[PDB]
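Lab notebook, page 48
Experiment: co-folding of the full assembly
Goal: obtain a model of how the components sit together before planning crosslinking
Operator: M.T.
Materials (sequences as entered):
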Amino acid sequence: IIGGEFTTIENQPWFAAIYRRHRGGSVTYVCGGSLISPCWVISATHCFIDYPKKEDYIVYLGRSRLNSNTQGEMKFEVENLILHKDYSADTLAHHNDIALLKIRSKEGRCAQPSRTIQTIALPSMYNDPQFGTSCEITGFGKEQSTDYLYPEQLKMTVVKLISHRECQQPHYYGSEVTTKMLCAADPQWKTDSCQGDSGGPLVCSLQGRMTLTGIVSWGRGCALKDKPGVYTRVSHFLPWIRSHTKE
Amino acid sequence: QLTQSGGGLVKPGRSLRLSCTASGFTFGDYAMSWVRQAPGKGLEWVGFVRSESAGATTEYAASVKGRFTISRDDSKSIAYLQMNALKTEDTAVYYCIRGANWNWGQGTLVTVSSASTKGPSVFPLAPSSKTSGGTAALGCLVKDYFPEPVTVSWNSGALTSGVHTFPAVLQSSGLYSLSSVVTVPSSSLGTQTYICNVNHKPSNTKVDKKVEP
Amino acid sequence: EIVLTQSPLSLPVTPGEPASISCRSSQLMNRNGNNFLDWYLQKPGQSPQLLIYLGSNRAPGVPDRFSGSGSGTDFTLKISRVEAEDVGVYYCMARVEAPYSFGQGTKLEIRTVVAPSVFIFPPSDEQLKSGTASVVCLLNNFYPREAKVQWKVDNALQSGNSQESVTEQDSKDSTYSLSSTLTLSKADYEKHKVYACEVTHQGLSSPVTKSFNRGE
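Observation: model returned without errors.
Model output:
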């Protein structure tokens, strides 16, 4: 997350923090997640493409801090991981960058709601906000593209949706971008998502309820002019979701 | 994995379609790249086709965007680089690539020239009468052929160690010439035959010369 | 679009010593850390093979001696210790977006001095029937590459009737081979009797000569 500000997990209670064990007991933050159902988290498949083994990932809800434990947070294993069949990335762009994780705690419980722990509203077929609308993104991603550490407290920041006709442009990302994808940047490019923010939520206020209209997927820079972020547009995966999502 | 067919000699302004047949992997899951080289100099990237899951859009390089187009056919699992108005500066060995970069093929030299094909004559370089038990040298002289390339194997690729195939050289006329050469143990002559298999696809010559003492 | 210059263009190394080529660009990251610069090697022969992908990941089967590194605009490939087989041109390549592009290349030349094995081949009756005569002389598996051959037919040094070609460094013993070839009319071929190929080369004490008469 470039620009932005630090938040507590409460401003963003649907966020999920995904860790991978390197073995030894060694864990590292991999990707962000959004909790869409009390037993289901959704992310990007690139986050796990190289190490698909499920018995190997860890999800934390209600976690606002990275290596200190928040109060109220719950820990889960991964009952199942499902990457999108037609996931491709022979190029800058990812395609179909969408993954689901089935979580369950050591006590067998799925996710219990609270002020820390909330689900996120999926969009609906035709409810994508206007271009120029202001959604928020959040995560532990780096705070400068040339940086070594990850910020230890969660961040958030607000970007404005960009029309697909606009970032299909030469100066932008030309043919690299499809209509199953959704661009979004600051208008003076002062703030964006960065490495680490992958798999986290693009959230918009829709008819009141907070909603998950995008997933952090890819972009060229971290907040360069004419080089926005890019998101999996969740409306175009509602069947795939639905299909896989039930189980 | 990636056999490049099609190609050869063409006149300027004329056209040509290089195909590329694929195996061992799922052709539909990958972009397909193409890179040129041109003799003596480095690589120019020329274009790609996307996976299809990604929209199968194509990007091209500055040099070629006008003339070249580059297709796919998931069905037959081939990629095709159709080059249209052909410039002499387009002469190069052109590789199919798979993915951005994963697995190049062997490429196919396209040479764009007015001049006509000349299939080669292949002559032996018989061994001298020297010394058991050091090493003797025999060879094949491939002369007066156009355009490039020729391919030379010794006993159908059963004999690789100590083969040297020298850069073709453009004779004072306009025809290329070259020689391939083996070193073998002296002891081996008279008992072991030595054939050079010579290949010039531009003139559909296949010539196999036995090179005996 | 993105222009890469790599340095240096040629680069000589003693096997067991480490080498280091460096590609300098002007662009290049994505949002997961990866820089979109690859390293290839074209081995003598042809067909480039991918060495490092995505800046720092070693392609599969690529030996452990190779190493991707760089950041920003300055990327560099590294061999901990060269081997005979590593001779070739190295190309770095930019594929962040838009049009892709290569560097010019780097030619890694690699060994002790070793003398040519000289041989000489008379024309064939088959080529005489044609009506032209190619006698050839091959210098075999020598290092360095600086070489002169002189052609004598009877008692005349030859000038300007002969072309040489040379191989690229060998992958296995790092030596070159050369073939010079003198062409003459069938007439000149039988007006004279002794044909010789005189080779001077740093690894040779005195020049060496290889000849034949017509009828051996």
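Interpretation: The interface with chain C takes residues 35, 37, 42-45, 59-62, 93, 95, 100-102, 104-107, 121, 123-126, 128-129, 135, 137, 139, 141, 143, 164-169, 171, 177-179, 181, 183 of chain B (CB under 8 Å).
Next step: discuss with group before ordering constructs.
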